Design a protein around this ligand. Structure first.
Ligand code: HEM
Ligand code: HEM
Ligand code: HEM
Ligand code: HEM
Ligand SMILES: CC(C)(Oc1ccc(NC(=O)Nc2cc(Cl)cc(Cl)c2)cc1)C(=O)O
Ligand SMILES: CC(C)(Oc1ccc(NC(=O)Nc2cc(Cl)cc(Cl)c2)cc1)C(=O)O
Ligand SMILES: CC(C)(Oc1ccc(NC(=O)Nc2cc(Cl)cc(Cl)c2)cc1)C(=O)O
Ligand SMILES: CC(C)(Oc1ccc(NC(=O)Nc2cc(Cl)cc(Cl)c2)cc1)C(=O)O
Lengths: 146, 141, 141, 146
């Protein structure tokens, strides 16, 4: 990730304010609502038949929190995203066969959620750094396809 | 063409934009230039710095075109025909860049309208921006 | 909707397919399953090996749907409405996969019709397959 | 690139029959015809205003040959695509600012051209291997964006 020391500091400072439960549930639920094909991977999660049901689904919220926790691991290991995400790359690529384009979509949904939560504090500069982050995470997750 | 429900969501959300469409267009452009620097090369003779007169002006144009699109959801091809000629024939804008600007527009709307930017409205605006992007890339020979 | 020139190219090229549409659909599927293995998971109860009865059958269905689309270029949304319900609502086919199959269809046409697969015809068929893919992903709620 | 020793052998065997001039001119010209936005990067090449003009343009043919020569270098250095393409990644990313999605498009156009030239010899299995190759080349070319 082409992140400078000063950009890195700003990225970690924002994550310090991120509630992984609320932000995670919301980002995963938005993925499922905005890009409904992603629901194919979540049949076991129960009711996903409308936006209210998806957003209010306990399994969506619980799982989104776990996803965001792993994003946080990435944020705190920017110089080794490949290693950080190696196990999850095997899961998502080799076991689940998720198209890697969707890793980029989820990263961008997370960015939109951060924008919603942080408002004007989520500056164009800070968003730019987060774009580098979510691109790095998506690339690391897709390693098993490379 | 969007569903009736999507059109309703899009017109509703755009009403909440109030008179801020131009401001939001400018900010979306800034977010795009910083988040996706490849896009800067389309504007070689612009001052792309924050608060730039040129970026402010250009954001007003983008916001005005989106406002026009919101008013013409039943005929985006007709409403945006000329702008599609410009973006494809003349400017040769890579279709990827429409996805980038659309993402930056959603980001900007989320910043400023957090209570209105619900999951269903996010979905409808995404479809709206996809439809606009499709028309804007439709003129490729 | 495609240009008049594109429709002419597409109908012309499809005429050169002769009675091979089903064969070409089957081969395109095989190319997709091997070239892009993620796609195999949509067909959990198929024998996906070469010459498979099921792949041959399924390729005939894809070829027949494309032949129907070629005959209905002025109204792809109407012609493919039901198939779009199936692929989106029921199958939740990732839109990326339509790009993959389309690439494999072009590859297959190039294999078998090298003299007819000219640059302009390649361009028109690409637009045709994009239009078909757009309708097939249009049913997403 | 997840290419086995046997796949690798088949990939190199095909390249032995590839006329980089004819295949290269044709692949670059098809890129410019099928995805006309790519013409933005080639204003100096002169007349690109219709398919006949693009395909018959001497600068397109000359440049396509150079492109295909570099693809051939990739084919012969599959275990070090990153190093092979490092200089060209700086050119395409840092200097030209080409969106990396277009590296994937050109790879796929090349695949279609190989299919056209080789017909039934370009088997589904051989195409699959070439998909791994052109994905690896695209990823290596985009390194400066990573
Ligand atoms: C791109 C960023 C993503 C990250 C960081 C991520 C992270 C994770 C994590 C941490 C787990 C939990 C493993 C465990 O606790 O057992 C998980 C599981 C899973 N992920 Fe993701 N994921 C991402 C994207 C996606 C996408 C785009 C999809 C599909 C649309 C997906 C589908 C799944 C599925 C189906 C599971 C297993 C759920 C189950 O237990 O049934 N992931 N992911
Ligand atoms: C939602 C999508 C977009 C809309 C609604 C939109 C709208 C507009 C409008 C209204 C204009 C002014 C045309 C005039 O001068 O009369 C314009 C110009 C322009 N647009 Fe866009 N645009 C969009 C996306 C993009 C993208 C993705 C790019 C490339 C990154 C781009 C690059 C340009 C350029 C280079 C100009 C001319 C600037 C100048 O030199 O004056 N646009 N656009
Ligand atoms: C050019 C694009 C495509 C066309 C014209 C097309 C056409 C068809 C047709 C005609 C059927 C038969 C429907 C029936 O049973 O009556 C079908 C079924 C199906 N398609 Fe597609 N399709 C396309 C792309 C795709 C893609 C990209 C995928 C996913 C990789 C896909 C996955 C499926 C699946 C899983 C079935 C059901 C198979 C079964 O279990 O019987 N299709 N399609
Ligand atoms: C993806 C596989 C690609 C490869 C292997 C490749 C390879 C090359 C090579 C070998 C050169 C020559 C450097 C030299 O001899 O000076 C070159 C130059 C260039 N490439 Fe590519 N390229 C690829 C894709 C693209 C794409 C997709 C575009 C834009 C659409 C592009 C735009 C250019 C331009 C504008 C030049 C310089 C032309 C000039 O001299 O004015 N390349 N590339
Ligand atoms: C061939 C030619 C002259 O084409 C064109 C050049 C410019 C435009 N601009 C417009 O549509 N502006 C525009 C401006 C606003 Cl605020 C809103 C909307 Cl909806 C549109 C269209 C076509 C060229 O490229 O030189
Ligand atoms: C294809 C289909 C059916 O749905 C979709 C609509 C939107 C998206 N999102 C995007 O690709 N965003 C996106 C955002 C960025 Cl920052 C970069 C890139 Cl490369 C892509 C995905 C699918 C449609 O066209 O309607
Ligand atoms: C809700 C329901 C029943 O939807 C659907 C299920 C199947 C189809 N199939 C078709 O269109 N076949 C079809 C077959 C050929 Cl050869 C050509 C063409 Cl053009 C179409 C459409 C909708 C479901 O998903 O269960
Ligand atoms: C977007 C626009 C204007 O033009 C375009 C039409 C087709 C393509 N090609 C593709 O993306 N192929 C493609 C092929 C593969 Cl194997 C994988 C992937 Cl990920 C993509 C690009 C642009 C349109 O929609 O008409």
């Amino acid at each position: 990730v082409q992140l400078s020391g000063e950009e890195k500091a700003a990225v970690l400072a924002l994550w310090d304010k991120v509630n992984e439960e609320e932000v995670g549930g919301e980002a995963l639920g938005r993925l499922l609502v905005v890009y409904p094909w992603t629901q194919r991977f979540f049949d076991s999660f129960g009711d996903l038949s409308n936006p209210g049901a998806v957003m209010g689904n306990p399994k969506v919220k619980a799982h989104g929190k776990k996803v965001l926790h792993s994003f946080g691991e990435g944020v705190h290991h920017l110089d080794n995203l490949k290693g950080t995400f190696a196990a999850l790359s095997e899961l998502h690529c080799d076991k689940l066969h998720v198209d890697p384009e969707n890793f980029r979509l989820l990263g961008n949904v997370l960015v939109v959620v951060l924008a919603r939560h942080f408002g004007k504090d989520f500056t164009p500069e800070l968003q730019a750094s987060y774009q580098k982050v979510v691109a790095g995470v998506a690339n690391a997750l897709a390693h098993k396809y490379h | 063409v969007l569903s009736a429900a999507d059109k309703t969501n899009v017109k509703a959300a755009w009403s909440k934009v109030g008179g801020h469409a131009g401001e939001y267009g400018a900010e979306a452009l800034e977010r795009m230039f910083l988040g996706f620097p490849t896009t800067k090369t389309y504007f070689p003779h612009f001052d792309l710095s924050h608060g730039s007169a040129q970026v402010k002006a250009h954001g007003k144009k983008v916001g005005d075109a989106l406002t026009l699109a919101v008013g013409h959801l039943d005929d985006l091809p007709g409403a945006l025909s000329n702008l599609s000629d410009l973006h494809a024939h003349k400017l040769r804008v890579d279709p990827v860049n429409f996805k980038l600007l659309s993402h930056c527009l959603l980001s900007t709307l989320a910043v400023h309208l957090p209570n209105d930017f619900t999951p269903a409205v996010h979905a409808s605006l995404d479809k709206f921006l996809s439809s606009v992007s499709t028309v804007l890339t439709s003129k490729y020979r």
